[PDB]
Design an enzyme around this catalytic site. Structure first.
Site, PDB file in Angstrom:
ATOM      1  N   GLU A  35       3.824   2.699  14.515  1.00 19.28           N
ATOM      2  CA  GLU A  35       3.450   1.511  13.403  1.00 19.28           C
ATOM      3  C   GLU A  35       2.842   0.784  14.026  1.00 19.28           C
ATOM      4  OE1 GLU A  35       4.526   1.931  11.137  1.00 19.28           O
ATOM      5  OE2 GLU A  35       6.945   3.245  10.884  1.00 19.28           O
ATOM      6  N   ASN A  46       1.158  -3.871   1.714  1.00 16.42           N
ATOM      7  CA  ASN A  46       1.248  -3.093   1.555  1.00 16.42           C
ATOM      8  C   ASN A  46       1.220  -3.323  -0.148  1.00 16.42           C
ATOM      9  OD1 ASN A  46       3.012  -1.636   3.364  1.00 16.42           O
ATOM     10  ND2 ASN A  46       4.866  -3.668   3.277  1.00 16.42           N
ATOM     11  N   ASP A  48       2.068  -3.316  -2.699  1.00 17.93           N
ATOM     12  CA  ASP A  48       3.430  -4.171  -3.852  1.00 17.93           C
ATOM     13  C   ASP A  48       3.370  -6.130  -3.158  1.00 17.93           C
ATOM     14  OD1 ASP A  48       4.696  -4.172  -1.243  1.00 17.93           O
ATOM     15  OD2 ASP A  48       7.012  -3.366  -1.912  1.00 17.93           O
ATOM     16  N   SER A  50       4.356  -7.582  -0.701  1.00 16.13           N
ATOM     17  CA  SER A  50       5.111  -7.375   0.850  1.00 16.13           C
ATOM     18  C   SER A  50       4.141  -6.972   1.970  1.00 16.13           C
ATOM     19  CB  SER A  50       5.791  -6.175   1.790  1.00 16.13           C
ATOM     20  OG  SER A  50       5.284  -5.089   0.604  1.00 16.13           O
ATOM     21  N   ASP A  52       4.615  -6.250   6.481  1.00 13.91           N
ATOM     22  CA  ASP A  52       4.882  -5.147   7.283  1.00 13.91           C
ATOM     23  C   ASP A  52       4.408  -5.983   8.736  1.00 13.91           C
ATOM     24  OD1 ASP A  52       6.333  -3.319   5.225  1.00 13.91           O
ATOM     25  OD2 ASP A  52       4.549  -1.973   6.210  1.00 13.91           O
ATOM     26  N   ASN A  59       9.258  -5.220   7.371  1.00 14.11           N
ATOM     27  CA  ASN A  59       9.147  -5.364   5.711  1.00 14.11           C
ATOM     28  C   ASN A  59      10.086  -6.469   5.226  1.00 14.11           C
ATOM     29  OD1 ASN A  59       7.638  -4.724   3.615  1.00 14.11           O
ATOM     30  ND2 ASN A  59       8.092  -2.660   2.643  1.00 14.11           N
TER      31      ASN A  59
END
Ligand SMILES: [Cl-]
Ligand SMILES: [Cl-]
Ligand SMILES: [Cl-]
Ligand SMILES: [Cl-]
Ligand code: NA
EC number: 3.2.1.17
Length: 129
Positions: A35, A46, A48, A50, A52, A59
Site C-alpha cells: 500500500e 482515486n 472518484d 476520494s 487514500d 480511504n
C-alpha cells in the site's frame, strides 16, 4: 516516517494488530509494504475524488474526513491527516474497524492481489518480536 520492515511489525504488534480478526502479523506487514512502501505520509488520489492515506492507504470515501470527498462518511471519526502521522496508532485503530467490516483484509485490494495466499510470514522473518 518510512518504517523498516521489522520496525513496523513491532509497532503493529504493540498496537494489537497481530492476529486481529485472525490475520497474522505478516499479512499486515505485507499489506503495508504494497500500500505505502512503509511510508506513513503516502497518499494516493482515486478516480472518484476520494484519497487514500498513510501506511495502510485508508480511504476517505468511508473512513476519515478530508473535507473534499462529497457524500463520504468518516467511520473512524478522524481527520484523514491523522493517518499520516509518524505514530501509527490512528491507522491501526481505523484498520481494525475496516477489517471488521465484513470482507476481512479484502478491503485492501493490494492485499488481495499481492499478499493473500502468499508466504506472508516472510514479512516478519528474522524480526525480534
Ligand atoms: Cl521520510
Ligand atoms: Cl505471519
Ligand atoms: Cl468530505
Ligand atoms: Cl476474514
Ligand atoms: Na470521508
Amino acid at each position: 516516517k518510512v518504517f523498516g520492515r521489522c520496525e513496523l511489525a513491532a509497532a503493529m504488534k504493540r498496537h494489537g494488530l497481530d492476529n486481529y480478526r485472525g490475520y497474522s502479523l505478516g499479512n499486515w506487514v505485507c499489506a503495508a509494504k504494497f500500500e505505502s512502501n512503509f511510508n506513513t505520509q503516502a497518499t494516493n488520489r482515486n478516480t472518484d475524488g476520494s484519497t487514500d492515506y498513510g501506511i495502510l492507504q485508508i480511504n476517505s470515501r468511508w473512513w476519515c474526513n478530508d473535507g473534499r470527498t462529497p457524500g463520504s462518511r468518516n467511520l473512524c471519526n478522524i481527520p484523514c491527516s491523522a493517518l499520516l502521522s509518524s505514530d501509527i496508532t490512528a491507522s491501526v485503530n481505523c484498520a481494525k474497524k475496516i477489517v471488521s467490516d465484513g470482507n476481512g483484509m479484502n478491503a485492501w485490494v493490494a492485499w488481495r492481489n499481492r499478499c493473500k495466499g502468499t508466504d506472508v510470514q516472510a514479512w516478519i522473518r528474522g524480526c525480534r518480536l
